[PDB]
Amino acid sequence: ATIKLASKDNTLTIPNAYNLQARASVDWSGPIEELTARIAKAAHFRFRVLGKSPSVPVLISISTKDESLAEILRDIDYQAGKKASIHVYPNSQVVELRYAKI
C-alpha cells in the first residue's frame, strides 16, 4: 500500500498511540493486510498477522486527504467487520491484524 505522511467496539483493541497521531493522505483500495502493514511501518510499529488469511481476501477502501493513522486503522477495522480485527498495543508498539477465521 501507499500513504502520504503530512459496530464492533475497538476502544480497547485499538487505543490511541503517539506515533498513530501522525496525519496522512490515502487514496487506495485493496487487501486489508497490505495497507495495515504499510500504516504500521509508517508509524514505526511492528506488524504481525494472527490466524490464516482467508481464501477470498478482505478488501477495504480508504479515501482521505487528511486523517490520522489511528483513525484510518479504525476505519479499516470497521470495514473488515467479523472477517478480521486490528489490535494496537501502544507500549510495545505493535499493530496486530487478527483474521477471525474460524
Residue numbers in the entry: 37 to 42, 66 to 161
Question: What do the authors say?
Answer:
Intracellular replication of L. pneumophila requires functional Dot/Icm T4BSS, irrespectively of host species. It has been well established that L. pneumophila translocate more than 100 effector proteins into host cytoplasm using the Dot/Icm T4BSS. The complex is supposed to contain two outer membrane lipoproteins, DotC and DotD, two inner membrane-spanning proteins, DotF and DotG, and one outer membrane-associated protein, DotH. The outer membrane targeting of DotH depends on lipoproteins DotC and DotD, presumably in a manner analogous with the function of pilotin in targeting secretin inT2SS: the outer membrane lipoprotein pilotin is required for the stabilization and outer membrane targeting of the secretin. In conclusion, the present study revealed that the structurally conserved DotD/N0/T3S domain is widely spread throughout outer membrane complexes of even distantly related secretion systems, including T2SS, T3SS and T4BSS.
To clarify the structure and the molecular mechanism of Dot/Icm T4BSS, we crystallized DotD without the first 20 amino acids which contain the signal sequence for secretion across inner membranes and the lipidation site, Cys20 (DotDΔN), and determined the structure at 2.0 Å resolution. DotDΔN is composed of the compact C-terminal domain (DotD domain) and the N-terminal disordered region. The N-terminal third of DotDΔN was invisible in the electron density map, except for a short β-strand (Ala-37 to Ala-42) that we call the “lid. The DotD domain forms a βαβ sandwich fold composed of two α-helices flanked by an antiparallel three-stranded β-sheet on one side and a mixed three-stranded β-sheet on the other side. DaliLite database search showed that the DotD domain has striking structural similarity to the N-terminal subdomain of secretins, which are outer membrane pore-forming proteins of T2SS and T3SS. Thus the DotD domain and the N0/T3S domains of the type II/III secretins share remarkable structural homology, although they are poorly related in amino acid sequences. The most remarkable difference between DotD and the N0/T3S domains of secretins is that DotD has a lid that makes β-strand addition to β-strands β1 and β3. The lid is located on β1 and covers the hydrophobic cleft formed by α1, α2 and β1. The side chains of two hydrophobic residues in the lid (Ile-39 and Leu-41) stick into the cleft.
